[PDB]
Amino acid sequence: SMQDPLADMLTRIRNAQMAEKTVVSMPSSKLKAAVAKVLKDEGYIADFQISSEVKPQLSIELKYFEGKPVIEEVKRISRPGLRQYKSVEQLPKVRGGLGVSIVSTNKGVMTDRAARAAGVGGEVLCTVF
Amino acid sequence: ALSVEEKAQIVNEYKQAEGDTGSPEVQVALLSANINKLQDHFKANGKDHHSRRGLIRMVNQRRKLLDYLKGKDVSRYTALIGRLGLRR
RNA sequence: AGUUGGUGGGGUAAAGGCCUACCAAGGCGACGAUCCGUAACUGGUCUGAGAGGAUGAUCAGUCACACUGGAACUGAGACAC
RNA sequence: AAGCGCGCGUAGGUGGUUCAGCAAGUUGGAUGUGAAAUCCCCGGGCUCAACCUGGGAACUGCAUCCAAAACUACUGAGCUAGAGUACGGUAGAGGGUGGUGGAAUUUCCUGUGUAGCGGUGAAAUGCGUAGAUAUAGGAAGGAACACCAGUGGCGAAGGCGACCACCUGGACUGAUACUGACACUGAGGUGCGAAAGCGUGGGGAGCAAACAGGAUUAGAUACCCUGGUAGUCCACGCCGUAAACGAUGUCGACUAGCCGUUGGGAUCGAUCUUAGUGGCGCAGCUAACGCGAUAAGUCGACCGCCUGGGGAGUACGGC
RNA sequence: UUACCACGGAGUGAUUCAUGACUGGGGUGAAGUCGUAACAAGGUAGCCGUAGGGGAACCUGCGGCUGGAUC
RNA sequence: AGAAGGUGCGCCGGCUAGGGUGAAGGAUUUACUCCGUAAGCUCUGGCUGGUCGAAGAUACCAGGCCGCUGCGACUGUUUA
Ligand SMILES: [Mg+2]
Ligand SMILES: [Mg+2]
Ligand SMILES: [Mg+2]
Ligand SMILES: [Mg+2]
Ligand SMILES: [Mg+2]
Ligand SMILES: [Mg+2]
Ligand SMILES: [Mg+2]
Ligand SMILES: [Mg+2]
Ligand SMILES: [Mg+2]
Ligand SMILES: [Mg+2]
Ligand SMILES: [Mg+2]
Ligand SMILES: [Mg+2]
Ligand SMILES: [Mg+2]
Ligand SMILES: [Mg+2]
Ligand SMILES: [Mg+2]
Ligand SMILES: [Mg+2]
Ligand SMILES: [Mg+2]
Ligand SMILES: [Mg+2]
Ligand SMILES: [Mg+2]
Ligand SMILES: [Mg+2]
Ligand SMILES: [Mg+2]
Ligand SMILES: [Mg+2]
Ligand SMILES: [Mg+2]
Ligand SMILES: [Mg+2]
Ligand SMILES: [Mg+2]
Ligand SMILES: [Mg+2]
Ligand SMILES: [Mg+2]
Ligand SMILES: [Mg+2]
Ligand SMILES: [Mg+2]
Ligand SMILES: [Mg+2]
Ligand SMILES: [Mg+2]
Ligand SMILES: [Mg+2]
Ligand SMILES: [Mg+2]
Ligand SMILES: [Mg+2]
Ligand SMILES: [Mg+2]
Ligand SMILES: [Mg+2]
Ligand SMILES: [Mg+2]
Ligand SMILES: [Mg+2]
Ligand SMILES: [Mg+2]
Ligand SMILES: [Mg+2]
Ligand SMILES: [Mg+2]
Ligand SMILES: [Mg+2]
Ligand SMILES: [Mg+2]
Ligand SMILES: [Mg+2]
Ligand SMILES: [Mg+2]
Ligand SMILES: [Mg+2]
Ligand SMILES: [Mg+2]
Ligand SMILES: [Mg+2]
Ligand SMILES: [Mg+2]
Ligand SMILES: [Mg+2]
Ligand SMILES: [Mg+2]
Ligand SMILES: [Mg+2]
Ligand SMILES: [Mg+2]
Ligand SMILES: [Mg+2]
Ligand SMILES: [Mg+2]
Ligand SMILES: [Mg+2]
Ligand SMILES: [Mg+2]
Ligand SMILES: [Mg+2]
Ligand SMILES: [Mg+2]
Ligand SMILES: [Mg+2]
Ligand SMILES: [Mg+2]
Ligand SMILES: [Mg+2]
Ligand SMILES: [Mg+2]
Ligand SMILES: [Mg+2]
Ligand SMILES: [Mg+2]
Ligand SMILES: [Mg+2]
Ligand SMILES: [Mg+2]
Ligand SMILES: [Mg+2]
Ligand SMILES: [Mg+2]
Ligand SMILES: [Mg+2]
Ligand SMILES: [Mg+2]
Ligand SMILES: [Mg+2]
Ligand SMILES: [Mg+2]
Ligand SMILES: [Mg+2]
Ligand SMILES: [Mg+2]
Ligand SMILES: [Mg+2]
Ligand SMILES: [Mg+2]
Ligand SMILES: [Mg+2]
Ligand SMILES: [Mg+2]
Ligand SMILES: [Mg+2]
Ligand SMILES: [Mg+2]
Ligand SMILES: [Mg+2]
Ligand SMILES: [Mg+2]
Ligand SMILES: [Mg+2]
Ligand SMILES: [Mg+2]
Ligand SMILES: [Mg+2]
Ligand SMILES: [Mg+2]
Ligand SMILES: [Mg+2]
Ligand SMILES: [Mg+2]
Ligand SMILES: [Mg+2]
Ligand SMILES: [Mg+2]
Ligand SMILES: [Mg+2]
Ligand SMILES: [Mg+2]
Ligand SMILES: [Mg+2]
Ligand SMILES: [Mg+2]
Ligand SMILES: [Mg+2]
Ligand SMILES: [Mg+2]
Ligand SMILES: [Mg+2]
Ligand SMILES: [Mg+2]
Ligand SMILES: [Mg+2]
Ligand SMILES: [Mg+2]
Ligand SMILES: [Mg+2]
Ligand SMILES: [Mg+2]
Ligand SMILES: [Mg+2]
Ligand SMILES: [Mg+2]
Numbered sequence: 001s002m003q004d005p006l007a008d009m010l011t012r013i014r015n016a017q018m019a020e021k022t023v024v025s026m027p028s029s030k031l032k033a034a035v036a037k038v039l040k041d042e043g044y045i046a047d048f049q050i051s052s053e054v055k056p057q058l059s060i061e062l063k064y065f066e067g068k069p070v071i072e073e074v075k076r077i078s079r080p081g082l083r084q085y086k087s088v089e090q091l092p093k094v095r096g097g098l099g100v101s102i103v104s105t106n107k108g109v110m111t112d113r114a115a116r117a118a119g120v121g122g123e124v125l126c127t128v129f
Numbered sequence: 130a131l132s133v134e135e136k137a138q139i140v141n142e143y144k145q146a147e148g149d150t151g152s153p154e155v156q157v158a159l160l161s162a163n164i165n166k167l168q169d170h171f172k173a174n175g176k177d178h179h180s181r182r183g184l185i186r187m188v189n190q191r192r193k194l195l196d197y198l199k200g201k202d203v204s205r206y207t208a209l210i211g212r213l214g215l216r217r
Numbered sequence: 218a219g220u221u222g223g224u225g226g227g228g229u230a231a232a233g234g235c236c237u238a239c240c241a242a243g244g245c246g247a248c249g250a251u252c253c254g255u256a257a258c259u260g261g262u263c264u265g266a267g268a269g270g271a272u273g274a275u276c277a278g279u280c281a282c283a284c285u286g287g288a289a290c291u292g293a294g295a296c297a298c
Numbered sequence: 299a300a301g302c303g304c305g306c307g308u309a310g311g312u313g314g315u316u317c318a319g320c321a322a323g324u325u326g327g328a329u330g331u332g333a334a335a336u337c338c339c340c341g342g343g344c345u346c347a348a349c350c351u352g353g354g355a356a357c358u359g360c361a362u363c364c365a366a367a368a369c370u371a372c373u374g375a376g377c378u379a380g381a382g383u384a385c386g387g388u389a390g391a392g393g394g395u396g397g398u399g400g401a402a403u404u405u406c407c408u409g410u411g412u413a414g415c416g417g418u419g420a421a422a423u424g425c426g427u428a429g430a431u432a433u434a435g436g437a438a439g440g441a442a443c444a445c446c447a448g449u450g451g452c453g454a455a456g457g458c459g460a461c462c463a464c465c466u467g468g469a470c471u472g473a474u475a476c477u478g479a480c481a482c483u484g485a486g487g488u489g490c491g492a493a494a495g496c497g498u499g500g501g502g503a504g505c506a507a508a509c510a511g512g513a514u515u516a517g518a519u520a521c522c523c524u525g526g527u528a529g530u531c532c533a534c535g536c537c538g539u540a541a542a543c544g545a546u547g548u549c550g551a552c553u554a555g556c557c558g559u560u561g562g563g564a565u566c567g568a569u570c571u572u573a574g575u576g577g578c579g580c581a582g583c584u585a586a587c588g589c590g591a592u593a594a595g596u597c598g599a600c601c602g603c604c605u606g607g608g609g610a611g612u613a614c615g616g617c
Numbered sequence: 618u619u620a621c622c623a624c625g626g627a628g629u630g631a632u633u634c635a636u637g638a639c640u641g642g643g644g645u646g647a648a649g650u651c652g653u654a655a656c657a658a659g660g661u662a663g664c665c666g667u668a669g670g671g672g673a674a675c676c677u678g679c680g681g682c683u684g685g686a687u688c
Numbered sequence: 689a690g691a692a693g694g695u696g697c698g699c700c701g702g703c704u705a706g707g708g709u710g711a712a713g714g715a716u717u718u719a720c721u722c723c724g725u726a727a728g729c730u731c732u733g734g735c736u737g738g739u740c741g742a743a744g745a746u747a748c749c750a751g752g753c754c755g756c757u758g759c760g761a762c763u764g765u766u767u768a
């Protein structure tokens with residue numbers, strides 16, 4: 001019944017990335033917007049736009065580079081059934097730093113690298129590589 | 130089992146915003162009227178389980194609506210319980 | 218059913234149903250009470266990449282016991298190896 | 299090996315979207331404690347090692363203060379994308395109580411008529427001159443509802459086909475208006491639940507466990523034939539089981555296409571769009587078969603269940 | 618002399634061990650006796666629930682499934 | 689099932705709680721009426737001492753109980 005909207009966002013991105021599409025549209029929220037922005041800063045997507053009119057729609061344009069999609073493995077970590085939190089010393093590494101893990105901290109939603117840069121841990125949302 | 134006229138007079142008696150058929154009170158009143166009306170039908174037809182399923186569904190709907198209304202506003206809850214003449 | 222709380226009093230080195238006389242009908246329990254079986258606990262030890270699993274010889278800390286069941290005396294301290 | 303037969307629902311678990319607050323969870327810091335020994339690092343002594351020994355690190359924990367506010371929790375105010383209500387229509391073996399039809403079987407009575415009927419792989423038992431089968435007319439009674447009929451429909455599942463009246467549940471379909479998260483799942487509990495079976499009382503045409511007789515056979519407590527009782531039917535009550543099966547839990551969101559079909563809508567026989575019901579098939583998945591928008595693909599929420607084969611879904615105990 | 622109380626008595630229950638004439642199934646055994654139920658259309662298609670019957674595998678009725686061959 | 693088994697019980701004081709009847713008074717329907725009554729009489733209790741005997745349900749009165757089995761379901765009837 002959409003008890004996790006972020007998992008729906010990542011599932012939509014993965015499913016339409018596998019299907020060789022160009023734009024993904026979904027209901028938006030101020031958390032999905034932060035996730036989309038942090039992906040944009042990491043070069044995993046082309047662009048994201050938020051619609052107006054009371055029921056905003058968020059649309060994301062994807063990248064392909066070669067014949068294979070740029071995002072090959074995206075996975076949610078902290079679900080509503082588990083709620084995983086980690087400290088600075090325990091922030092997970094995906095592909096030994098070749099990827100990124102999104103972390104929600106009291107300074108906002110950022111990457112694990114920025115998380116150690118500010119020295120603030122938090123909740124591990126998902127891992128992308 | 131309700132009629133058009135019966136539903137119209139029920140909603141008129143229980144409307145709260147002059148044209149609201151979705152407020153909890155109207156739905157509770159309609160469900161209570163239907164539950165009270167079907168009793169005499171089930172008195173004679175004891176072997177009709179298939180309709181008794183729908184009756185149970187209406188009872189459950191009324192229960193959930195009353196619980197929501199109690200959670201929201203206690204005064205309207207007590208007033209509705211008083212007018213409908215039901216235990217809880 | 219002193220069972221749970223209150224009051225007056227007693228008692229203790231000291232709080233306290235610890236005890237007593239009244240007043241009330243309370244307290245605990247599927248977040249496992251009660252009952253049955255088994256067992257001193259910990260620092261630690263052995264295994265394992267780790268997470269875990271098994272386990273409390275030797276050494277150190279605490280507890281309990283001293284043929285079996287009770288009781289008190291003396292004493293700063295014992296219900297006394 | 300492993301999805302409860304199917305629903306409803308209690309405790310619990312989880313929660314669409316905006317603001318604002320709070321600081322329980324969360325994060326960072328400081329302080330106290332976390333006995334010594336042991337394990338680890340750098341050393342020092344016994345000719346080396348085991349062994350002893352100095353300092354450190356560790357003891358991943360707990361507690362108290364300070365700070366932050368993204369997420370969860372809590373509080374106040376919102377919103378309409380989830381859920382529901384009001385209004386016209388559509389289809390349907392959905393359920394219950396009565397009444398009424400036609401075909402056919404059987405039994406009884408009566409007319410004509412005379413030597414077979416029936417059944418089989420071939421026979422026999424059985425029925426016939428105490429007049430059978432066939433044939434014509436009349437009467438009684440019970441049960442099932444040809445043709446329509448369909449990969450067709452409805453129902454939570456089990457299941458539901460003659461026609462009509464009365465009572466009654468749900469689903470599809472179109473626009474507007476309304477409520478404003480009222481939702482999902484669900485241990486326990488609560489109900490519904492084929493057939494066979496059980497109790498009391500009716501009814502009894504056909505079929506037919508048990509049973510009798512005739513065949514077949516080495517035997518035949520079977521398959522085949524002739525009969526035939528419970529039962530099958532009705533009312534009320536119980537029983538709780540099935541290869542109760544899609545051997546596939548419920549709910550929600552995404553992912554190329556082609557051919558049908560049942561209800562309903564739109565736009566101009568064509569195109570589009572919903573809710574079902576079928577056939578293929580790209581990715582993907584799988585041990586393979588195969589699944590493939592009605593997933594067994596990509597994901598979330600909750601529940602049930604499995605841990606080699608027998609013994610055994612058995613024994614004992616409870617209900 | 619009173620109060621408290623150990624040992625010890627009397628009555629009636631619960632639970633748990635061992636054992637018991639005699640009985641019921643199960644498993645494991647070896648060139649035993651009777652049949653041939655399943656696997657092929659296994660020679661009456663097999664299974665599932667329930668009822669009756671029979672030396673035994675099993676047979677028959679009622680409902681169900683395909684995890685059934687020919688077509 | 690009164691299963692089985694157990695505890696108390698006499699007499700004299702102290703304190704204490706209830707019921708019935710019932711003057712005076714009050715009311716109005718003024719009379720074979722309603723309420724209600726101090727004392728007296730009468731019937732139920734409670735917790736606290738003391739005291740005698742060998743023994744307080746002291747006499748008469750007044751169930752013995754339990755465990756396995758056969759038969760018949762039971763209450764009833766029958767050979768004056
Ligand atoms: Mg007391
Ligand atoms: Mg005191
Ligand atoms: Mg006290
Ligand atoms: Mg326990
Ligand atoms: Mg011990
Ligand atoms: Mg391992
Ligand atoms: Mg370890
Ligand atoms: Mg080790
Ligand atoms: Mg231990
Ligand atoms: Mg020792
Ligand atoms: Mg010590
Ligand atoms: Mg200590
Ligand atoms: Mg010590
Ligand atoms: Mg201590
Ligand atoms: Mg000690
Ligand atoms: Mg000793
Ligand atoms: Mg000794
Ligand atoms: Mg001693
Ligand atoms: Mg002494
Ligand atoms: Mg002394
Ligand atoms: Mg002393
Ligand atoms: Mg001591
Ligand atoms: Mg001593
Ligand atoms: Mg001692
Ligand atoms: Mg000592
Ligand atoms: Mg299931
Ligand atoms: Mg199922
Ligand atoms: Mg189920
Ligand atoms: Mg259940
Ligand atoms: Mg259930
Ligand atoms: Mg079953
Ligand atoms: Mg539910
Ligand atoms: Mg709840
Ligand atoms: Mg939310
Ligand atoms: Mg909640
Ligand atoms: Mg907020
Ligand atoms: Mg902290
Ligand atoms: Mg230490
Ligand atoms: Mg050296
Ligand atoms: Mg603040
Ligand atoms: Mg004839
Ligand atoms: Mg005729
Ligand atoms: Mg069906
Ligand atoms: Mg039946
Ligand atoms: Mg029967
Ligand atoms: Mg019957
Ligand atoms: Mg009968
Ligand atoms: Mg017959
Ligand atoms: Mg036959
Ligand atoms: Mg016959
Ligand atoms: Mg017959
Ligand atoms: Mg019988
Ligand atoms: Mg019937
Ligand atoms: Mg079926
Ligand atoms: Mg199953
Ligand atoms: Mg299986
Ligand atoms: Mg199910
Ligand atoms: Mg599902
Ligand atoms: Mg549902
Ligand atoms: Mg679903
Ligand atoms: Mg869905
Ligand atoms: Mg296919
Ligand atoms: Mg699979
Ligand atoms: Mg597999
Ligand atoms: Mg999950
Ligand atoms: Mg889950
Ligand atoms: Mg899930
Ligand atoms: Mg086993
Ligand atoms: Mg075994
Ligand atoms: Mg075993
Ligand atoms: Mg059993
Ligand atoms: Mg056993
Ligand atoms: Mg049993
Ligand atoms: Mg005795
Ligand atoms: Mg005894
Ligand atoms: Mg004893
Ligand atoms: Mg014994
Ligand atoms: Mg024995
Ligand atoms: Mg013997
Ligand atoms: Mg067979
Ligand atoms: Mg055979
Ligand atoms: Mg066969
Ligand atoms: Mg044969
Ligand atoms: Mg076969
Ligand atoms: Mg069975
Ligand atoms: Mg059978
Ligand atoms: Mg039978
Ligand atoms: Mg049987
Ligand atoms: Mg037979
Ligand atoms: Mg039968
Ligand atoms: Mg069948
Ligand atoms: Mg007695
Ligand atoms: Mg004396
Ligand atoms: Mg006696
Ligand atoms: Mg006795
Ligand atoms: Mg006997
Ligand atoms: Mg005898
Ligand atoms: Mg007699
Ligand atoms: Mg007698
Ligand atoms: Mg007898
Ligand atoms: Mg008898
Ligand atoms: Mg008898
Ligand atoms: Mg008598
Ligand atoms: Mg008598
Ligand atoms: Mg005599």
